[PDB]
Subunit: 471 residues, 3 copies
Amino acid sequence: CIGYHANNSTEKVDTILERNVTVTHAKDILEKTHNGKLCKLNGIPPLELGDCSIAGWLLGNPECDRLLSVPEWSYIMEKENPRDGLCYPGSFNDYEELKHLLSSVKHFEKVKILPKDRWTQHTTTGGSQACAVSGNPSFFRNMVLTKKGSNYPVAKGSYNNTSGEQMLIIWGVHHPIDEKEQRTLYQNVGTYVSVGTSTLNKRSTPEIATRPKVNGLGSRMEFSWTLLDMWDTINFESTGNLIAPEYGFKISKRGSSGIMKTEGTLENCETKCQTPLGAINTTLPFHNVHPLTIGECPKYVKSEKLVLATGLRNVPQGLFGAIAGFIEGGWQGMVDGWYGYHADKESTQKAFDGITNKVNSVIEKMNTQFEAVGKEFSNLERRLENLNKKMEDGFLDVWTYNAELLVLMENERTLDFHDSNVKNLYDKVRMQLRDNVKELGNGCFEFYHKCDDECMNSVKNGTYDYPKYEE
Amino acid sequence: DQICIGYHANNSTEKVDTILERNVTVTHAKDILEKTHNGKLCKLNGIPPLELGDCSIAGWLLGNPECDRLLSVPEWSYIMEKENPRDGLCYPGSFNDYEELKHLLSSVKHFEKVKILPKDRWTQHTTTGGSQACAVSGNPSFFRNMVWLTKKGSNYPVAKGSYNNTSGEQMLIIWGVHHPIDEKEQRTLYQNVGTYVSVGTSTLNKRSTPEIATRPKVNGLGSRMEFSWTLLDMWDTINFESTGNLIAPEYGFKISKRGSSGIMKTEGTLENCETKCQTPLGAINTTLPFHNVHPLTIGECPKYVKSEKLVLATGLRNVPQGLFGAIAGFIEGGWQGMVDGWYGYHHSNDQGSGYAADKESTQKAFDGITNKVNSVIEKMNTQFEAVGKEFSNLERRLENLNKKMEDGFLDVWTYNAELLVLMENERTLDFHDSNVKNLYDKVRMQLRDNVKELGNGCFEFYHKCDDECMNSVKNGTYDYPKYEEE
Amino acid sequence: CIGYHANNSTEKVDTILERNVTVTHAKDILEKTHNGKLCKLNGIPPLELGDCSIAGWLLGNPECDRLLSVPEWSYIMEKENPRDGLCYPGSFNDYEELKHLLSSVKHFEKVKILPKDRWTQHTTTGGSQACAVSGNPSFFRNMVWLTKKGSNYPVAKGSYNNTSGEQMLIIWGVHHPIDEKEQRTLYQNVGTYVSVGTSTLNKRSTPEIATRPKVNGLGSRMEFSWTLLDMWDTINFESTGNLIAPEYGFKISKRGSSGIMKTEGTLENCETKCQTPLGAINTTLPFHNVHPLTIGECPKYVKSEKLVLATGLRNVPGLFGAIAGFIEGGWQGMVDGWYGYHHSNDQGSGYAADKESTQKAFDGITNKVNSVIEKMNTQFEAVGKEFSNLERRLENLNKKMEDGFLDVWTYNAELLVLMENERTLDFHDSNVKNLYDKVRMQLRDNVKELGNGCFEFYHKCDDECMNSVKNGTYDYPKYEE
Ligand SMILES: CC(=O)N[C@H]1[C@H]([C@H](O)[C@H](O)CO)O[C@@](OC[C@H]2O[C@@H](O)[C@H](O)[C@@H](O)[C@H]2O)(C(=O)O)C[C@@H]1O
Ligand SMILES: CC(=O)N[C@H]1[C@H]([C@H](O)[C@H](O)CO)O[C@@](OC[C@H]2O[C@@H](O)[C@H](O)[C@@H](O)[C@H]2O)(C(=O)O)C[C@@H]1O
Ligand SMILES: CC(=O)N[C@H]1[C@H]([C@H](O)[C@H](O)CO)O[C@@](OC[C@H]2O[C@@H](O)[C@H](O)[C@@H](O)[C@H]2O)(C(=O)O)C[C@@H]1O
C-alpha cells in the first residue's frame, strides 16, 4: 500500500488554478511584523531632534539648547512639524538641499570661526523678544551686527578653513520693515551683504517691506549656507544687515541617507531596516509594513499574506492523478515523512531537498540595497515630489504583481511535484512485483504469495525478487 | 461493442503562442489587452475637467479679455488645454513658477474668485491704464483681474494696499512688475525713477526692482510684464508697497484642494460621459490588467504596454477531424461532435452510437481555467496617476528623467505581460492534456482484462455491453461479472 | 531499447528545485563582453573634448584651440574633471542644462555675430595672465572684454537679429571686481549694469564687487549666462560697465538629445548601437552586466555573473521519472539525436536516434530561447545624467530609480532562468517517457518489460522487424511461446 501524508493543519494556500487549498505545511514570505521601537542602524544611532527643526539646531535657537547631539549618525529623527526653528520669523535658502546633507554623517563637530569678540566698531548685543531665553532678550546662539554709537563702518570677517574637514557655514540678512528702522539700526541705507569662497560668490541686499507680524516681528531674517572646502577661506563684507556666524560645523560624511518623520524615541536596539512603526529583523523578500523605510529593506508590497505551499494537499481520512486521485486519501498515521508504505526515506529526502531549494530560490535571489524612500521637498517642488511619488507608486505595482503571481504559479507547481513523486513511488513498486500481486487501484498491491516482513523490507529496499511460482 | 475516450474540437481559428510553439489554433481564448476607447473626453469619477479651449492657465487667471466667456466650474478633476493655446499673456512678459502653479490648479475641490483690493480705492493713482495688446474690439484694455497703477497728474504717491484673508480658505494671489523700455516711458508712466514693488506675507518677502531695457517688440511692445504669485494663508495679511511699476490684483481666488491631478493636452471637448480612466484619444471603460491605447492617461489605468495583442488560451488545442501525450498524441484527434463538455466518451453499441461529455472533469477544469484568468486579472493593483507632466525650457534634464522612467516601466510591464502569457499558455495546454490522460486511466483501471486496449484511446469489450453497463463505466460503477470470450 | 543522449559536457545549470545540474547543452543569455573601444553611435561620432570642459570649449579657453570639433555628434566624451575650463575664475549659470542640450546635436556652427572691431569708444584688447598664451596675457577666444577707452566708458549698445536660419546659442558674462578701485580703473563708472534682452528674455545684471579668495591669481570672478536666440529674433546688449560680450554665436539644430560619457579613452572608428565607458557592446541578448553607465540601445543591466539557460537534457553518463529514473543512464554513444533506441540482435547492436521527437524537441527548445530573447523591448536611453551641487536630492532620485530597475530586472532574470530550467528538464523527461510508452503499447505481450527501459522479445526480431518498432509499424504475428 503506497500512500502520502496528512496532518492537523488548516493553513490555506492559493494556486493559479485553485484556491483555499488546505496544505500539510506552508511558508510565508511577507514580512508584516515590526517591533514598534526605533533603533540604531548598523551600529549607528539616528540624530534625535525631538521638537527641533534642523534649522533651530544649527542656528542655535534658545529652545534647542539641550539636545542629544551625537558626533555620528545614520539617519535623523524629526517630528512632523517641530515647532522650534526660526524663533525669529524668516526663511532658509536651499533648506531641503541641506537636510539631505545632514541626514547621515560620519563625523560632526561645532568649532568657533568668527569670534563674537572680534567685531569692534560694531554693536553685537543685538537681540529680540521672540528669541528670548526665559524672559530675556537673547538671540540665536551660533549667530551674531548693529550700529555702535551713530556709526556703521564696513564689516569684514574672514576664515581660512584649517580644520582638516569640509565645513558648513551659515549666515544671513536682516529685512526690516522700514527705512526708519533701517537707519535706527544700520545708519546707512543702500546696504549689502557679500560672501565669497573659491566656489561661491553672493551679494544680497535687504528687501524692505510692510509685512504681517509673526512672533512679534514685521521683519525677517533670511539665511543661506555653503560648504567651505579644506584650506579655503570664506569672506564677509557688509554695510549693514549682516547676521554673522561665530561657529562652523566640521562635517565628514558619509553616505547620505534621509530623514525619518516620527514621534517615538531611540531605544538602543539594532536593525538593518527601520520603519516609522518600528524596525524589522527579517530575511524575507517582501514586506508590507510601511512605505517610508530607511535602510536595506525588502520590497514594499500591497499584500496581506503571501503563503507558499511547501507540503502537499492535506487530505485526511491534481496533474498526475495520484494525490487526491487514485490514492484517495492521506494517512494521518504516517508521520516520519511525506510519502511511505503500509515512510519512504529516499524520496522524502529528495522532495524535502526539492522544496527547500525552491523556498531559497525565491528568497536568496532578491537583491536589496540601502535606500531612503522618504524625501524632502519645498512648496515650489510639488512637481518634483509627485515625480518621486509616481515612481514608488510604480515599483509598488510591479513588485506586488510579480509577488502575488510568483506565489500562485509556484504553488500549483509544488502541488504537482508531490503528486508526481507519489506517482513515481507507486511506479517504482509496480515494476518490481508485477505478476506476484493484484493491482487493486487504490495504490495497493495484494500478495498472491505469502509475504513476511523480510519480504516487506525488500520492496522498500527495492530488492523484492522474486521466486514466486504461485497462481 | 466498444468505448472511446476523446476531446473537443470546433470551428475556431484563434491562434496563441506559448514558450515552445507559435501560431497554435486553440478552441477558446481570452485576450487581456485593453485597446479600445470611446473617443470621448469625460468627467472623472463624476467630476468634470476644466475646459479652457484655447486659453492658457495664465491667460485665464490674469483675465485676458480673450478668456471672458469661459466655462469656469466651481470644482474640477483635471484640466483640458490645447498644445499651445495662444490666448495667454496678451501683453508680452512672463510668469514666475508657472509650472508649479498648474500642477497646483490641476485639480481643485473648490475654486472661487473674490474681489480683494477694489480698483476704485486706489485714489491718487490713475487706474484706467490699458493697452492695444489687450485689445477689446479696437479699444485698448487690459487684464480683467489686474490693475495698472499709473501716475495721477504729475504725481505718484507711495502705493500701499492690504488684504487680511478672512475668506476661510487659502487664497491664490498674483501680481506683476512692469518693465519699461525707456527711462522716458518710465518717467511718463510713474514720474519717479528709482522705483520698487514690495510684497510681504507671513512667509513671503519680495522686493522687486523694474528691469528697464531695450528688447525686441512683441505684440507691439518692447516692454514686458513679469508676474508672480503666492498662496496667502487663512487669517494672514498680504502687503503691497510701490513707488512705481506695480500691477496690482483686484481679485483673489479661494481655493480648497483636494489631491492634485494633471493636465490633459487635447483638442477635444468634454462630452458628459463617465470614466475612471481618461486618455487624450478617448476614455477607457476596462477591467483588464494591461492596455496600449495611449501613454498619456489620467485616472486609474491599466499598465501601459507596448504590445499589439495579449491572447491567453482558455480552451485546448484545436485539432479537428502534448506534455502528457494524450491530446494530439495517442488520442490523435478532437471530436467536433462533442458539444456539451471539453472531455467525454464515445461508446459504440448495438443500441447506438453517441458522444457524451464527462461532466465531472469538464467542471473541475472550467473552475480551474476561470481562476487562472481571474488570477491574471485580479492581482493587478491600480492607482490614480497623471502621467503627462509639465516642464520648462530649462528643465530638459528633469523632463528626460520622467521619460527614462515611464520608459523603464514600459519595458518591465511589456516583458512580464508577454512572457506571462507564453508561460501560462504552455501550462494551459498541459492542464487539458493531463485531464484527458487521467480520464483515460480512470477507465483503463476499471475495465482491465474485460476489454482490448486498442491504443487510440479506445476499448473493445470482449463481453456484451449494453447502455446500463456503459453508464457504469462513466459512473465509475463498472463491476464486473465478465468472463467471455476469450 | 528506448534511450536518451549523453555527451562529454560539464556545463551546469540551476533550476527552481535543483542546482549544479550537468546538462548536454546550454545557452547563456547574459552579455558580458565589450571591445574596450569607444565608437560612433549609429554611424555618428561623439564629440571628443579630451581634457576640455564644455564651458572651456564654448567660451574658447585658449587651451582648447586645437580641438576636434565636428559639425554633428551623437554623444560627448569628457574626462572626470577636465581641468581646461574657466581659466579665469568664475562660474556658469544653468551649466548642466546647457550640456544636456549640447549632449547631442544634428548640426553645430560658430558664426561671428558682434565683430570685436565695431566696439569703438571702448578698449577691447583686455586680457589676463590666467588665460595665458605662451607667457602673454590673453582671454577667451570667443569673448570680448569691454573696458574704458581713455578715461571714458560710453554706454555700450549692441544687437544681433538672428538671420542664420537656425536657433543660435548665445553666451555672455558679467565681470565681478574685488575693488571699487579696480572697478573705476576698468570701467571708470561705478553704478554699472549689464542688460540683455530678447523676445522671451530679460535680465539686468549688477556686478557683485567683493573681497574673495584668490584663484589662478585673481579674487575677481566672471559670471557667464546663456540663451537660445530664436529665428528672426534680436538680442540686445546694454552696458554701462562690466559686460563680457560674445564675438561669436552658435547655429545649432537638434535632434533628439543624448548624454555625456565620462571616460579616459579616445574614439577609435568602430561602429555600435550601444556604448559603455569600458567599451562598445555588439550584442543581441536581453540582459548584460558590463557597466551601468551606457548610452545607446542597450540590454537591461543586471547584477548577475551568469544566466545559463538549459537547452539540452540532463547529462547522465525527474518529474516523469525517466531520465535519471528507471532509465538510469545516458548513452554517450548516441550522437545523431537526443532520444533514441538500442536494439540487440543476431544481426548486430547499434544506437539510433528517434528523429521525429528529437526534432519536435529541438523546435520547442529553439522557441523557448527565442521567447526569452525576442520579447525584450529596448529603447534609446542615456542613463548618465548631469547635476549641480544644489541638486543632490534630484541626483538621488535618478539613482534610487535606476537602482529600483536594477532590482526588478535582476530578480526576474535570475528567477526566469531557474523556472524555465526546471521546465526544460521535465520537457525532455516527458519526451522520453512518451517514446517509451509508444513502444510499450506496440509490443505489449510479445516482449518482457525488463524495467530499465528495455524490452526482451520472446520472438525472433530481425532488422526489418526492429524498424517496424521505430516506424510505429510493429504488427504482429507472434505467438512463441
Ligand atoms: C539690535 C536691535 O535693534 N534689537 C532690537 C529689535 C530690532 O530693532 C528689531 O528686531 C528690528 O527688526 O527690536 C526689539 O524690539 C521689538 C519690538 O520693538 C518695538 O519698537 C516695536 O514697536 C515692536 O513691535 C517690536 O518690534 C526686538 O526684540 O526685536 C528689541 C531689540 O533690542
Ligand atoms: C497706461 C498706458 O500708458 N498705456 C499706454 C501704453 C503704455 O505706454 C505702454 O504699454 C508702456 O509699456 O502705450 C500704448 O501705446 C503703444 C504704442 O505707443 C507708442 O507711443 C509707441 O511709439 C509704440 O511703440 C507703442 O508702444 C500701448 O498700447 O501699450 C497705449 C496705452 O494707452
Ligand atoms: C583689462 C585688464 O585690466 N586686464 C588686466 C587684469 C584685470 O585688470 C584684473 O582681472 C582686474 O580684475 O589684471 C591682470 O593682472 C592680474 C594681477 O594684477 C596685479 O596688479 C594684482 O596685484 C594681482 O593680484 C593680479 O590680480 C590679469 O591678468 O588679470 C592683468 C590684465 O592685463
